């Protein structure tokens, strides 16, 4: 696709806060991590969630990200 929806972006942000020390900048390891820590009936959706989660992690390595509170 081109543009991600609210369902993807909201869910992909809970993943970052709960599991921040199991993620890195690689899409393929992140997807394997995500499929074990979430429930959903469509593999297409889980692919996009891991796609955006990788994008967030790169931004966090640079500076703070709005709406993400690691605490």
Partner 1 sequence: GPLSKKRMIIRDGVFYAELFEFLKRELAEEGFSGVSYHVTTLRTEIVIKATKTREVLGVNGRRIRELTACIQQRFNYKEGKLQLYVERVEVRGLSAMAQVESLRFKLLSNLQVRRAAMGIIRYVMESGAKGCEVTVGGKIKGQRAKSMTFRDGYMIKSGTAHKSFVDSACRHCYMRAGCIGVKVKIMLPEPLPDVITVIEPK
Beta carbon of residue 32, minimum distance to partner 1 (angstroms, whole number): 15
Cα 71 from chain centroid?
17
Q: Is 49 exposed, middle or buried (0-12, 13-18, 19+ CB in 10 A)?
A: buried
**Residue 23 touches which of RNA, partner 1, none (Cβ within 5-8 Å per kind):** none
DSSP state of 21: T
Q: What angle (nearest 5°) sits at the alpha carbon of residue 54, between those of residues 22 and 23?
A: 5
- Pick the piece of the chain touching partner 1 (CB under 8 A) from 23-31, 35-43, 55-63: 35-43
Nearer to partner 1, 52 or 62 (CB): 52
Q: Tell me which residues touch partner 1 (CB under 8 A).
A: 7, 11, 14-15, 18-19, 37-42, 45, 49
């Amino acid at each position: 696709g081109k543009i991600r929806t609210k369902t993807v972006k909201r869910a992909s942000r809970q993943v970052v806060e709960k599991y921040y020390s199991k993620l890195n900048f690689d899409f393929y390891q992140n997807k394997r991590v995500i499929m074990d820590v979430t429930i959903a009936e469509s593999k297409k959706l889980k692919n996009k969630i891991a796609g955006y989660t990788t994008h967030i992690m790169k931004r966090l390595a640079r500076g703070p990200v709005r709406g993400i509170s690691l605490k």
